[PDB]
Coordinates of C-alpha atoms and ligand atoms in Angstrom, one line a residue:
Chain A
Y116 CA -1.5 -13.1 -7.2
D117 CA -0.4 -10.2 -5.6
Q118 CA -1.9 -9.8 -2.3
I119 CA -3.4 -7.4 -0.1
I120 CA -4.3 -7.8 3.6
Chain B
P215 CA 5.6 12.1 10.2
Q216 CA 5.8 9.5 12.3
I217 CA 3.0 7.6 12.6
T218 CA 2.1 5.1 15.6
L219 CA 0.2 2.2 15.1
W220 CA -2.1 2.1 18.3
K221 CA -4.6 3.4 16.3
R222 CA -5.4 2.6 12.5
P223 CA -3.1 4.7 10.4
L224 CA -6.0 6.7 8.4
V225 CA -4.8 9.4 6.4
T226 CA -6.8 11.7 4.1
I227 CA -6.2 11.3 0.1
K228 CA -6.9 13.2 -2.8
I229 CA -8.3 11.5 -6.2
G230 CA -10.3 13.3 -8.9
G231 CA -10.3 16.3 -6.8
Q232 CA -12.2 14.1 -3.8
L233 CA -11.1 13.8 -0.7
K234 CA -11.2 10.3 1.1
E235 CA -9.7 8.6 3.7
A236 CA -7.6 5.4 3.3
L237 CA -5.3 3.1 5.5
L238 CA -1.6 3.3 5.4
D239 CA -0.9 -1.0 4.6
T240 CA 2.4 -2.7 4.4
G241 CA 0.6 -6.1 4.1
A242 CA -0.7 -4.7 0.9
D243 CA 1.4 -5.3 -2.5
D244 CA -1.1 -2.5 -4.0
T245 CA -3.5 0.3 -3.5
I246 CA -7.3 -0.6 -3.8
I247 CA -9.7 2.0 -3.5
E248 CA -13.9 1.6 -3.2
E249 CA -16.0 2.0 -6.4
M250 CA -15.4 5.5 -8.0
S251 CA -15.0 6.9 -11.4
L252 CA -11.2 7.2 -12.8
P253 CA -10.4 8.4 -16.2
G254 CA -8.7 5.7 -18.8
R255 CA -8.3 2.2 -19.8
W256 CA -8.6 -0.7 -17.3
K257 CA -6.9 -4.1 -17.2
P258 CA -8.2 -7.0 -15.0
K259 CA -6.2 -8.0 -12.0
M260 CA -6.9 -10.9 -9.7
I261 CA -5.6 -10.0 -6.0
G262 CA -5.8 -12.5 -2.6
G263 CA -6.9 -11.4 0.7
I264 CA -7.5 -12.8 3.9
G265 CA -10.6 -14.3 2.8
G266 CA -9.7 -15.4 -0.7
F267 CA -9.3 -13.9 -4.2
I268 CA -11.2 -11.6 -5.9
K269 CA -11.4 -9.5 -9.6
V270 CA -10.5 -5.8 -9.6
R271 CA -10.0 -3.2 -12.1
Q272 CA -6.5 -1.7 -12.5
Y273 CA -6.0 1.6 -13.5
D274 CA -2.4 3.0 -14.4
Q275 CA -0.8 6.2 -13.9
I276 CA -3.4 7.5 -11.5
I277 CA -2.6 10.9 -9.9
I278 CA -3.0 10.6 -6.3
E279 CA -2.2 12.8 -2.9
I280 CA -1.7 10.8 0.1
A281 CA -1.4 12.8 3.5
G282 CA -0.3 15.4 1.2
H283 CA 2.3 13.8 -0.7
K284 CA 2.1 13.7 -4.4
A285 CA 1.8 10.0 -6.3
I286 CA 1.1 9.0 -9.7
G287 CA 0.4 5.2 -10.1
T288 CA -1.6 2.3 -10.1
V289 CA -5.1 2.1 -8.4
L290 CA -7.4 -0.7 -8.1
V291 CA -10.9 -0.3 -7.8
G292 CA -13.0 -3.5 -6.6
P293 CA -15.0 -4.5 -3.4
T294 CA -12.7 -3.5 -0.3
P295 CA -13.8 -3.3 3.4
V296 CA -11.8 0.1 3.8
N297 CA -9.7 2.2 1.0
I298 CA -5.9 0.8 1.2
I299 CA -2.7 2.3 0.4
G300 CA -0.5 -0.4 -0.2
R301 CA 3.5 -0.7 -1.1
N302 CA 3.2 0.7 -4.9
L303 CA 2.4 4.2 -3.6
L304 CA 3.8 3.9 -0.2
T305 CA 7.4 3.8 -1.8
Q306 CA 6.6 7.1 -3.7
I307 CA 5.8 8.7 -0.9
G308 CA 9.0 7.4 1.1
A309 CA 7.5 5.5 3.9
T310 CA 9.5 3.2 6.0
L311 CA 8.5 1.0 8.7
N312 CA 10.8 1.5 11.9
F313 CA 11.5 -0.2 14.8
Chain C
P124 CA 16.0 -1.3 11.9
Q125 CA 14.4 0.6 9.0
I126 CA 12.5 -1.4 6.5
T127 CA 11.9 -0.2 3.1
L128 CA 8.8 -0.9 1.2
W129 CA 10.1 -2.1 -2.1
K130 CA 9.5 -5.2 -0.9
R131 CA 7.2 -7.7 1.4
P132 CA 8.4 -6.7 4.9
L133 CA 9.0 -9.9 6.0
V134 CA 10.5 -10.9 9.3
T135 CA 11.2 -14.0 11.6
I136 CA 9.2 -14.6 14.4
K137 CA 9.5 -17.1 17.0
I138 CA 6.0 -18.5 18.1
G139 CA 5.1 -21.8 20.6
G140 CA 8.7 -22.9 20.3
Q141 CA 8.6 -22.5 16.3
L142 CA 10.4 -20.2 14.0
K143 CA 8.0 -18.7 11.2
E144 CA 8.2 -15.9 8.6
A145 CA 5.5 -13.1 8.7
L146 CA 4.5 -10.2 7.3
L147 CA 4.6 -6.8 9.2
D148 CA 1.0 -5.4 8.3
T149 CA 0.2 -2.0 9.5
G150 CA -3.4 -2.5 8.2
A151 CA -4.0 -5.4 10.3
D152 CA -5.8 -4.7 13.6
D153 CA -4.8 -8.1 14.5
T154 CA -2.0 -10.8 14.3
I155 CA -3.0 -14.0 12.6
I156 CA -0.7 -17.2 12.0
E157 CA -1.3 -20.5 9.9
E158 CA -2.9 -23.4 11.8
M159 CA -0.6 -24.4 14.8
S160 CA -0.9 -25.7 18.4
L161 CA -0.9 -22.9 20.7
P162 CA -1.1 -23.4 24.8
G163 CA -4.4 -22.5 26.7
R164 CA -7.8 -21.3 26.3
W165 CA -9.4 -20.3 22.9
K166 CA -12.3 -19.3 21.8
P167 CA -13.7 -18.6 18.2
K168 CA -13.5 -15.5 16.0
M169 CA -14.1 -14.4 12.4
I170 CA -11.7 -12.1 10.5
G171 CA -12.5 -10.6 7.3
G172 CA -10.9 -8.5 4.5
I173 CA -10.6 -8.6 0.8
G174 CA -12.3 -11.6 0.0
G175 CA -14.4 -12.1 2.7
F176 CA -14.2 -13.6 6.3
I177 CA -12.6 -16.8 7.6
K178 CA -12.9 -18.5 11.1
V179 CA -10.2 -18.3 13.3
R180 CA -9.3 -19.3 17.3
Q181 CA -8.5 -16.3 19.2
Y182 CA -5.7 -17.2 22.2
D183 CA -4.7 -14.3 24.3
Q184 CA -1.4 -13.5 26.3
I185 CA 0.9 -15.0 24.0
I186 CA 4.5 -14.6 23.6
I187 CA 6.0 -14.0 20.3
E188 CA 9.7 -13.1 19.4
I189 CA 9.7 -10.9 16.3
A190 CA 12.8 -10.1 14.9
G191 CA 14.5 -10.4 18.0
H192 CA 12.0 -8.3 20.3
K193 CA 9.8 -10.1 22.6
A194 CA 6.2 -8.9 23.0
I195 CA 2.8 -10.4 24.4
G196 CA -0.6 -10.2 23.3
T197 CA -3.7 -12.2 21.7
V198 CA -2.8 -14.5 18.2
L199 CA -5.5 -15.6 16.0
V200 CA -4.5 -18.9 14.3
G201 CA -6.4 -20.0 11.4
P202 CA -6.5 -20.6 7.3
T203 CA -4.4 -17.4 6.7
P204 CA -2.5 -17.3 3.2
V205 CA 0.4 -15.5 5.0
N206 CA 1.4 -15.2 8.7
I207 CA 0.7 -11.7 9.7
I208 CA 1.8 -9.1 12.5
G209 CA -0.7 -6.9 13.1
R210 CA -0.9 -3.5 15.1
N211 CA -1.6 -5.3 18.6
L212 CA 2.1 -6.3 18.4
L213 CA 3.6 -3.7 16.1
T214 CA 2.8 -1.4 18.7
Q215 CA 4.8 -3.5 21.6
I216 CA 7.8 -3.4 19.6
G217 CA 7.8 0.2 19.1
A218 CA 7.2 0.1 15.3
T219 CA 6.5 3.3 13.3
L220 CA 5.5 4.5 9.8
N221 CA 7.6 6.9 8.8
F222 CA 7.5 9.6 5.7
Ligands
CL470 CL1 -1.7 5.9 17.0
CL471 CL1 -9.8 -4.6 -23.9
CL472 CL1 2.6 2.2 -9.0
CL473 CL1 7.9 -9.5 -2.3
CL474 CL1 -3.2 -7.8 22.2
CL475 CL1 4.5 4.5 21.2
NA476 NA1 -3.8 -17.9 26.9

């Protein structure tokens, strides 16, 4: 899954 | 502009005629904003962050202005600690990291 | 260098004698590394983001070589899904966002 950090 | 990182890289964005604050985030694949009304259909998406995965709503081909630069692209809506501009729109406004 | 944002901005770092890959993350206040041993004292901390919070160990005055540039600062160690170089060290290598 795409990652948002 | 050249933006240093001594403070959070917060900019003004405009989406649906409304001004909001958002963080320029090179660590984000995608753009995610807090709950708001967007036009059109949405699709499901799962995203991974520091503390785990969440489900969000994916809205495509949304007009958004970022620090005065026009973009049209995918915006996710879901529970985020801050509005985040990720790489999908940072590339549209021509942003690079430089050292 | 000038790093585009078409893909994730990954670089090689050296920390604690070890080579790791890490993400240059302007959205991150802090630098967060996967579980490893570091010397000296530490204290617990909670950090959060999308998906919630994780507990980490906070080590101060740690030297990290980031794509060839040395910097010193606080490093957090814990169960992060990706090694993150945050603003506390990006400033020290002179990193800017440009558009
Ligand atoms: Cl600054
Ligand atoms: Cl459907
Ligand atoms: Cl997009
Ligand atoms: Cl990538
Ligand atoms: Cl620091
Ligand atoms: Cl500076
Ligand atoms: Na220390």
